[PDB]
């Protein structure tokens, strides 16, 4: 689950952070943070997504609450004028106000201030209530889904497919990807496969997405949970409210990519889609397997320690699993039941109590199994580096690269670059 013990595995970030991880990759929107600088300032350079157009989500926006403003009351005045500023200066399609510990405490009415602002100025303003102290990032991810109820609701109908018009295919198959964040532009590797099968994605939920894309989500024919289970709540609420079926898959590894595409085929039901999807997987497996053989000698048989940190990390396992590296995973008492249940299957009906111990447990735990690389996410990078151990970030946020068939092409490259690096013996 999750609870928090002071200075013990106490790092993870608020629900606000969590909400902002999920809503920011909606590029053309204005993303106003309603707090003091602790909140905005830093999380702004940010991480991950790549846009193929608008870069508004890259502009740090925030009502910059001075102390006077919290000698209560002014907090609201500012926000109202902060939206007026966003709307006139940048004219966004829509505006998202994120709530924060200070303003939640002094009782700030985000919702009502937002609605007033919608009406007076004419730009949809969506309130995300997830100040940090509510809980963890996951919680903020979920609160981000909930708010997309007052915006997903077909506040708008699916565009008419473009006059382009792929012939003999039922180009009329609409779908959604929930939780794909086009991080490092990785999704650019999957989208062409979808397009080939004639699957129109109404919205990649926070992956090169635009506001007007989200509006139309209820008309999807099949929703798909991309790793993220933090948002099971949207797949289910869409299912229950519009009848739209769903599944879970990842786009990391040959197996999952093939499987994700496979159960697209059988969920929205067509024999032409189905025959074509086998043809596609046919072609791609052929391609990728062939391009990977030369590399098998080099990485094959290397031991990887694996650590989960909120990072959707069982996905990567699917990948390197098939290649042939022995994997050892572990969660930390403050793990989801997801992690621990998966850590279970993978190996040993015992440890996922690696405790709240940082490198202490972690480092020595690498040593224990004689692991070759540690894989875990940016937090645990410097414990790996300084403990003179090879490392490989679990972020699609980054500039690699790792999904679909062609993803693995640089996953492999990235593993060798580090675990064959002559710098390691030199320290």
């Amino acid at each position: 689950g999750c609870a928090k013990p002071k200075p013990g595995a106490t790092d993870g970030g608020c629900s606000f952070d969590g909400a902002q991880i999920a809503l920011l990759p909606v590029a053309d929107v204005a993303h106003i943070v309603h707090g003091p600088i602790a909140c905005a300032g830093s999380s702004w350079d940010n991480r991950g997504t790549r846009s193929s157009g608008p870069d508004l989500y890259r502009i740090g926006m925030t009502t910059d609450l001075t102390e006077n403003d919290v000698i209560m009351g002014r907090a609201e005045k500012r926000l109202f004028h902060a939206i007026r500023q966003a709307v006139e200066s940048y004219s966004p399609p829509a505006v998202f106000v994120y709530n924060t510990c200070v303003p939640a405490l002094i009782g700030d009415d985000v919702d009502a201030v937002c609605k007033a602002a919608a009406e007076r100025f004419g730009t949809p303003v969506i309130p995300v209530d997830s100040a940090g102290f509510y809980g963890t990032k996951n919680l903020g991810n979920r609160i981000a889904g909930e708010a997309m109820l007052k915006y997903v609701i077909g506040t708008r109908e699916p565009d008419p497919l473009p006059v382009g018009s792929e012939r003999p295919g039922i180009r009329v198959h609409d779908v959604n990807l929930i939780g794909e964040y086009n991080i490092a532009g990785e999704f650019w590797h999957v989208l062409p496969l979808l397009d080939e099968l004639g699957l129109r994605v109404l919205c990649t939920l926070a992956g090169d997405a635009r506001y007007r894309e989200v509006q139309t989500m209820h008309r999807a024919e099949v929703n798909m949970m991309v790793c993220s289970k933090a948002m099971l709540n949207v797949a289910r609420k869409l299912q229950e409210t519009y009848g739209t079926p769903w599944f879970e898959g990842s786009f990391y590894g040959i197996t999952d990519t093939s499987q994700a595409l496979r159960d697209f085929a059988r969920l929205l039901d067509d024999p032409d889609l189905t025959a074509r999807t086998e043809a596609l997987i046919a072609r791609e497996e052929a391609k990728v397997r062939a391009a990977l053989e030369p590399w098998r000698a080099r990485l094959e048989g290397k031991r990887v320690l694996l650590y989960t940190g909120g990072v959707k990390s069982w996905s990567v396992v699917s990948a390197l699993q098939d290649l042939g590296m022995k994997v050892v995973a572990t969660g930390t008492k403050k793990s989801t039941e997801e992690d621990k249940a998966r850590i279970r299957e993978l190996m040993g009906d015992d440890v996922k109590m690696l405790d709240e111990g940082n490198a202490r447990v972690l480092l020595k735990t690498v040593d224990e199994y004689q692991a070759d690389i540690l894989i875990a996410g940016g937090r645990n990078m410097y414990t790996a580096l300084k403990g003179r151990v090879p490392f490989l970030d679990i972020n699609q946020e980054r500039e690699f690269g790792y999904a679909g068939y062609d993803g693995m092409l640089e996953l492999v490259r990235q593993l060798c670059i580090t675990l064959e690096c002559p710098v390691w013996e030199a320290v």
């Binding site: 002071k6 602790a38 830093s42 403003d69 410097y382």
Partner: protein
């Protein structure tokens, strides 16, 4: 004069007091800063710093709950102090208030007296308490405020007057001194046969500095409380950067050691006076080495005067760096056409600039465009502003996550100064 406005901050220049106060404690050896606030506050500060120095950084959380509406956090602050003390056993701990915990008043001193009663924990583990709400001041002031607190918490008092013995020179360092600035400042001192006690000392804590597989609490640190204790006695104290006046005052009242303070160490005059004050403090003369570098700098001014004479620049930096870069540039005939600061800060009279703004990068882009910046000085956040003008960036300042070398650049002194002229010359030349 200083201009301000309201009401939405667009791509903020400013970072929190409570982070800036956190890298001051980060410059004590074997230390551990502790935010009294919810966990995201620290998890954000942490990311900020590691992406800068690209090296791990220790930072923990009071972990205020949704019930930070009920029990102030009495329980939280206390269990945090007991936890760390018993888990990594710091040489020092930093107790910092956030915007959240300050919203009450947050019984700072008290929670610490609530953790100055129970205490099967030794005690003798010093604790620096700082008041630094996200909602006031800024990074630099934040930083300067945890130096006031560091000074006052550690040894200033009992002894006096007769506590001024050796040839030890205290240096009060400000926030925008890099390890490479700090090394210059220390090597510079040592070369006069003095011995620096740097307060505090990021040189010690922040680079690649260790030989254990794991370094838990910053052990690769700067100031040992041990040796900070001895700042009481010492010939003089040098104050580097105006942001630290209130700390030079605290330092100076509790001991009797006489300050000779000031500027960021940029340009001829700035380093001339630094060396002089050192020659005086120690009687012996300016080493032949810095005699030579002054000549090297003068030549760099002759060679770069073509390109920099009359350059329009726009600077987006903490007040100290502003004044430091303004001076440097003005010794070249360069005009700073646009200065944007994060918060009011001393350095009134504005320095010689007719005016400066508090209002961050959106303001910079438009002020820069107004007077026709040729070049913009600022942090990684400024790339975008610069790139959105048609203009070169020279980053300085304290978020630089996009530059491998940056956290460590020596800006200060004769070579530092001269290298900065090379860089502006080169940027200006190639974008023309």
């Amino acid at each position: 004069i200083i201009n301000r406005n309201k009401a939405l901050a667009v791509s903020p220049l400013k970072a929190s007091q409570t982070m800036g106060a956190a890298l001051a404690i980060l410059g004590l050896a074997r230390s551990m800063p502790l935010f009294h606030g919810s966990q995201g506050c620290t998890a954000f500060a942490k990311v900020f710093f590691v992406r800068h120095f690209r090296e791990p950084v220790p930072l923990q959380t009071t972990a205020m709950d949704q019930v930070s509406s009920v029990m102030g956090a009495d329980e939280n602050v206390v269990e945090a102090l007991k936890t760390i003390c018993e888990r990594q056993n710091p040489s020092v701990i930093g107790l910092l208030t956030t915007g959240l915990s300050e919203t009450q008043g947050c019984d700072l001193h008290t929670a610490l007296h609530e953790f100055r009663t129970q205490y099967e924990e030794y005690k003798d583990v010093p604790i620096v308490p700082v008041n630094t709400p996200d909602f006031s001041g800024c990074f630099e002031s934040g930083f300067a405020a945890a130096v006031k607190a560091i000074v006052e918490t550690l040894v200033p008092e009992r002894r006096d007057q007769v506590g001024k013995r050796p040839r030890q020179v205290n240096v009060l360092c400000s926030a925008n001194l890099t390890p490479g600035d700090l090394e210059y400042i220390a090597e510079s001192i040592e070369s006069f046969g003095l011995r620096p006690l740097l307060i505090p000392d990021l040189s010690g804590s922040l680079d690649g500095h260790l030989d254990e597989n794991r370094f838990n609490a910053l052990t690769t640190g700067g100031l040992s409380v041990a040796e900070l204790a001895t700042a009481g006695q010492s010939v003089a104290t040098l104050v580097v950067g105006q942001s630290l006046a209130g700390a030079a005052d605290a330092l100076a009242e509790r001991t009797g050691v006489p300050d000779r303070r000031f500027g960021m160490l940029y340009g001829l005059d700035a380093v001339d006076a630094w060396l002089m004050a050192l020659a005086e403090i120690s009687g012996n003369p300016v080493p032949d080495r810095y005699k030579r570098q002054r000549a090297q700098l003068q030549d760099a001014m002759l060679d770069t005067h073509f390109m920099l004479s009359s350059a329009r620049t726009a600077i987006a930096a903490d007040p100290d760096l502003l004044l430091g870069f303004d001076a440097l540039l003005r010794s070249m005939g360069a005009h700073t056409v646009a200065a944007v600061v994060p918060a009011r800060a001393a350095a009134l009279v504005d320095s010689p600039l007719p005016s400066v703004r508090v209002g961050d990068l959106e303001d910079l882009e438009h002020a820069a465009r107004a007077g026709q910046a040729q070049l913009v000085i600022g942090n990684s956040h400024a790339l975008a502003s610069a790139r959105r003008l048609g203009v070169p960036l020279l980053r300085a300042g304290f978020p630089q996550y996009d530059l491998l070398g940056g956290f460590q650049r020596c800006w200060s002194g004769y070579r530092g100064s001269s290298q900065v002229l090379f860089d502006l010359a080169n940027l200006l030349v190639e974008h023309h």
